Design a protein around this ligand. Structure first.
Ligand SMILES: CCCCCCCC/C=C/CCCCCCCC(=O)O[C@@H](COC(=O)CCCCCCCCCCCCCCC)COP(=O)([O-])OCC[N+](C)(C)C
Ligand SMILES: CCCCCCCC/C=C/CCCCCCCC(=O)O[C@@H](COC(=O)CCCCCCCCCCCCCCC)COP(=O)([O-])OCC[N+](C)(C)C
Ligand SMILES: CCCCCCCC/C=C/CCCCCCCC(=O)O[C@@H](COC(=O)CCCCCCCCCCCCCCC)COP(=O)([O-])OCC[N+](C)(C)C
Ligand SMILES: CCCCCCCC/C=C/CCCCCCCC(=O)O[C@@H](COC(=O)CCCCCCCCCCCCCCC)COP(=O)([O-])OCC[N+](C)(C)C
Ligand SMILES: CCCCCCCC/C=C\CCCCCCCC(=O)O[C@@H](COC(=O)CCCCCCCCCCCCCCC)COP(=O)([O-])OCC[N+](C)(C)C
Ligand SMILES: CCCCCCCC/C=C\CCCCCCCC(=O)O[C@@H](COC(=O)CCCCCCCCCCCCCCC)COP(=O)([O-])OCC[N+](C)(C)C
Ligand SMILES: CCCCCCCC/C=C\CCCCCCCC(=O)O[C@@H](COC(=O)CCCCCCCCCCCCCCC)COP(=O)([O-])OCC[N+](C)(C)C
Ligand SMILES: CCCCCCCC/C=C\CCCCCCCC(=O)O[C@@H](COC(=O)CCCCCCCCCCCCCCC)COP(=O)([O-])OCC[N+](C)(C)C
Ligand SMILES: CCCCOc1ccc(C(=O)CCN2CCCCC2)cc1
Ligand SMILES: CCCCOc1ccc(C(=O)CCN2CCCCC2)cc1
Lengths: 506, 104, 115, 63
């Protein structure tokens, strides 16, 4: 306070390398002003002393283009580390300003403070902004949550959907779903205007477009099976004017419409990672494989190439594996298929590496009492024995009797008592940890489905399926709102903030 | 018995038939057949425990006629059945505290 | 304290920071710089690294008497001193030992199968 | 505990010219003529807000 009232400048900009680091431990990014430093280190009495000065430029931008409200989003962390203070500094600065100039400003990435919290995965700052209710009289247009009416323990609220719905490009609902960097996406889709905005899209159009996509892919595998079982099979190049000729045509057309459509979505999508293929775009590849194998088998046949039956069985056997994709329309069957993924990754792939180490370990090294072509045969006599059938003519025709059990007992002790029973012991541990998360990690799958059905709708049909209602929330402030009802028995207060005196639906 | 048939067994059966009629008709490649009665039956007899290997000897291709027969055994034994036991353990654990009142 | 398995006395000694002015050379943990919520410390490695015989890192690993060895290797200058050895030389010597023993069993199989 | 015994046996089968190249530590000046062989670890702490009096360098940063 001595320095400021002696002529010190309150608008300096630390433009160093230590204040703009490349890595986290090499420095400290705070926002490059004396007001961002007093806020990001929890000093609320110096923040008030700096805003009461008149030379403070509260709407300035640093080297990244950030302002004071972009900078508090960047340094925000969980409850277990910072515990409260960034949420309390956010509205101290916001209410003192008194208008929408800070909240509607765009940095050099072209993002607002609302969209930067969703891009970076801050689920506590974002919970604060979306449901921000200010009940004071002169500053009520700075709210995003209003109260339409109330009577007793019954209320009716109005959220705001200005940048959180998908009517504009680069919105809050779109950013969270397509965000491969962060890892807590299924805890940001349970927040209150976003949970109800996906549930309404599913009941209006998106559960009917998901049934029509299931019928046409069901008929594609039935028709591909019957023309290949009752035998080249396809396209009927010798016209006898046969009725139900569409079956040879429908398979050929629909296999081109998938390969083109998956040729685009593979080309656009690239979050380069090994975790990307196992979680999002597994099925973008394996619908593109099948649509090639149907078309490529037709192109092989036309010269001479004779491999036109290998591809058709591959195209049929893969084409029935893909239909477990369509289980995500039901909560019961959908969560079951989620746990199939966690069991194949975390449990089964490690079992197979240890077993082959004994199967090719014992297998070549059995050719001692009977020799043999051992690598095809003695490996096969240990795999047939594991299926359950067995052929004991080789034990009778051995060099040594009952001693020809020691490599055959040591095989059965390991693969049955030890290795398989430890697989069941680990799947019980794996199911126990994923059962609490399977409801949210399922809803992250279905939310990406809804937002792709919405893109393939014409503009005259987008307008009919649209949420929202024009409300009058202030003097000439018309917003596009979403009404949610509530019953609360624990807080008994008298109601002063309301848009309507007379309650009820009307 | 009621809580296990509803919550666990009916979902297992829908996934298994999807492979049994998936692999079953699509096995008639190295041996062709009346496939839908027979090649489905040679994959269900194999699951019971008996097996008849004269069709593998009388195949068009030897040891390659295991790839559709190995991919059947990996899924139905390692994956699907062992995940049923892992879910019945979760289901018994939740109904054991309520079974005395829901019996009365 | 490392020979006898005392994991609470040993936690005290290895990270002993004395901030007073006349007695600061009795520390084994210093602070190089600090700015806001960001610091950078300097541990001491005089008898806890393997440059001398009978050191603190060697005693804990080869100690068959005690039973809480895996709770004394998570302490703060010792956890990071093993992690750095693995990335510099010890993960490359462990791959070369795996290749040569893999080729020893392949060659022993092929010359014994094709008699 | 298994992997730590592995690292300390690979280190014994190294010649003395190669021990010197793979070696942690840096000579710091921690007091008046007290040079020690130190190991730097960084930290971020949001819960204790104090003013800093003990430090070896006024000017922070990697240098
Ligand atoms: C108002 C009526 C007239 C409106 C017509 C307007 C035209 C609109 C449509 C325009 C074009 C649609 C694009 C499909 C292209 C051809 C097929 C194809 O190859 O794509 C794919 C199928 O995709 C589907 O077939 C889904 C069904 C979409 C049709 C919408 C029905 C009418 C919209 C009214 C809705 C309101 C209903 C509610 C009413 C109460 C094939 O690929 P896939 O494998 O099957 O997909 C899996 C994706 N995967 C690969 C990532 C795993
Ligand atoms: C090309 C076929 C592969 C065959 C071998 C495997 C090689 C690589 C194996 C790697 C093992 C570890 C990774 C597994 C896959 C990733 C995780 C996963 O999604 O699990 C899925 C496995 O669902 C299936 O089983 C069907 C997919 C094809 C597998 C073959 C089945 C029988 C094919 C018959 C013979 C055809 C032979 C092939 C013909 C050339 C389950 O997915 P979900 O959870 O239920 O749905 C949501 C998934 N999501 C969130 C990711 C959207
Ligand atoms: C071929 C038999 C037919 C089976 C179908 C074909 C399979 C083709 C599949 C091929 C690759 C598998 C899919 C991608 C996996 C990536 C990592 C992963 O998710 O695994 C996870 C589980 O931990 C493991 O699964 C360990 C892997 C076992 C090593 C054995 C060799 C390959 C196994 C395959 C077959 C064995 C046969 C061996 C024959 C040589 C690792 O844990 P995480 O959650 O990722 O944590 C991050 C780890 N990180 C920090 C390092 C990043
Ligand atoms: C045929 C084989 C011989 C077997 C004997 C004959 C079986 C004949 C039986 C017929 C119907 C089953 C009895 C009534 C079930 C009603 C709901 C229920 O309790 O299920 C529960 C478990 O979740 C499931 O069980 C999912 C069902 C699996 C779908 C597969 C098709 C039918 C399965 C059958 C066989 C598969 C073969 C597939 C072949 C096509 C759903 O959970 P919930 O506790 O109800 O919670 C409320 C859900 N709700 C909000 C939506 C209301
Ligand atoms: C493209 C993907 C790369 C992998 C290659 C996969 C391709 C196949 C792999 C190896 C095959 C080796 C040669 C056979 C094919 C040559 C054509 C042929 O004439 O054979 C015949 C059999 O053809 C088949 O149907 C294949 C046998 C099983 C079906 C597919 C499973 C094998 C996939 C394993 C790996 C999957 C992927 C691995 C990862 C999951 C077809 O023609 P045919 O002779 O008229 O019919 C015989 C009956 N007759 C003579 C009495 C009439
Ligand atoms: C392989 C063996 C197959 C045999 C069957 C195996 C079955 C399963 C295996 C696999 C299938 C799993 C998913 C497919 C089911 C559809 C998706 C879905 O979620 O169902 C939904 C309904 O579905 C409906 O829409 C009801 C059908 C009547 C109207 C649809 C006609 C077309 C659209 C009309 C306009 C035409 C276009 C415009 C023209 C004017 C589920 O709804 P629900 O069950 O009632 O309630 C559950 C609660 N829930 C909604 C939150 C979930
Ligand atoms: C998915 C990955 C695993 C797949 C399942 C494994 C089994 C796959 C099953 C079959 C794979 C091959 C298919 C054709 C069948 C044999 C033909 C052949 O060429 O084999 C050759 C190799 O056989 C030998 O030379 C025997 C000596 C052992 C080889 C080296 C040891 C391997 C162990 C370490 C391996 C490193 C990896 C270990 C991983 C931890 C020669 O065969 P042959 O001796 O002359 O007799 C048969 C020839 N005949 C048919 C014409 C009569
Ligand atoms: C409880 C529900 C499941 C029940 C268990 C399933 C197995 C039930 C077992 C037997 C059921 C029938 C009893 C009689 C046996 C055969 C006679 C017959 O009419 O079959 C006909 C169909 O066979 C074909 O046409 C083959 C082509 C595949 C059909 C379509 C694919 C089905 C997959 C998707 C299915 C959608 C539902 C999928 C659900 C996810 C003709 O047979 P065929 O080819 O001429 O040769 C046999 C004739 N013979 C005996 C006179 C020689
Ligand atoms: C048309 C047939 C439909 C019968 O559908 C099923 C057949 C077999 C199974 C099994 O689970 C096989 C039993 N199996 C259990 C483990 C040990 C050996 C026997 C389940 C459903
Ligand atoms: C080249 C063959 C590779 C196949 O690699 C496996 C073979 C068998 C198994 C099994 O698990 C055997 C199934 N077994 C399960 C318990 C009851 C009876 C059947 C796993 C992997």
């Amino acid at each position: 306070a001595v320095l400021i009232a002696a002529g010190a400048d309150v608008n300096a900009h630390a433009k160093g390398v230590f204040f703009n680091p490349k890595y986290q431990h090499e420095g400290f990014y705070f926002g490059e002003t004396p007001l961002a430093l007093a806020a990001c280190t929890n000093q609320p009495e110096i923040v008030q002393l700096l805003m009461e000065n008149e030379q403070t430029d509260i709407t300035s931008q640093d080297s990244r283009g950030n302002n004071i409200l972009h900078a508090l989003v960047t340094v925000a962390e969980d409850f277990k580390t910072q515990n409260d203070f960034v949420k309390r500094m956010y509205d101290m600065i916001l209410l003192r300003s008194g208008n929408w100039e800070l909240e509607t400003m765009r940095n050099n990435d072209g993002l607002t403070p609302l969209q930067l919290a969703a891009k970076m995965g801050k689920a506590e700052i974002l919970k604060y902004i979306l449901s921000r209710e200010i009940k004071e009289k002169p500053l009520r247009s700075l709210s995003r949550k209003f109260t339409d009416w109330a009577y007793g323990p019954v209320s009716s609220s109005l959220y705001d959907l200005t940048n959180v719905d998908t009517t504009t490009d680069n919105s809050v609902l779109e950013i969270i779903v397509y965000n491969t960097n962060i890892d807590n996406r299924h805890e940001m889709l349970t927040l209150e205007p976003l949970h109800t905005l996906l549930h309404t899209k599913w009941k209006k159009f998106a559960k009917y477009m998901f049934f029509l996509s299931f019928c046409f892919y069901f008929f594609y595998n039935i028709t591909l099976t019957l023309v290949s079982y009752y035998r080249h099979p396809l396209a009927l190049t010798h016209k006898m004017s046969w009725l139900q000729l569409l079956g040879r045509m429908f398979v050929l057309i629909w296999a081109t419409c998938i390969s083109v459509k998956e040729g685009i979505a593979i080309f656009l999508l690239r979050p380069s990672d090994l975790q990307s293929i196992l979680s999002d775009a597994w099925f973008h590849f394996v619908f593109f494989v099948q649509a090639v194998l149907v078309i490529l088998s037709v192109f092989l046949y036309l010269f001479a190439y004779k491999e036109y039956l290998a591809c058709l069985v591959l195209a049929m056997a893969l084409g029935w594996a893909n239909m477990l994709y369509y289980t995500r329309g039901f909560q019961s069957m959908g969560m079951y298929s989620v746990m199939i993924q966690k069991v194949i990754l975390h449990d089964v792939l490690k079992f197979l590496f240890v077993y082959i180490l004994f199967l090719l370990g014992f297998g070549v090294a059995l050719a001692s009492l009977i020799e043999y072509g051992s690598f095809s045969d003695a490996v096969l006599e240990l795999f047939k024995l594991t299926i359950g059938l067995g052929d004991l003519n080789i034990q009778q025709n051995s060099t040594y009797p009952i001693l020809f059990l020691f490599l055959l007992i040591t095989y059965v002790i390991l693969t049955f008592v030890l290795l398989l029973n430890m697989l069941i012991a680990l799947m019980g541990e794996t199911v126990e940890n994923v059962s609490k998360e399977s409801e949210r990690i399922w809803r992250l799958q279905r939310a990406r489905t809804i937002l792709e059905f919405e893109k393939m709708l014409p503009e005259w049909l987008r307008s009919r399926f649209r949420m929202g209602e024009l409300c009058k929330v202030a003097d000439e402030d018309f917003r596009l709102c979403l009404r949610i009802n509530e019953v609360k028995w624990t807080e008994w207060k008298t109601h002063v903030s309301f848009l309507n005196e007379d309650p009820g639906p009307i």
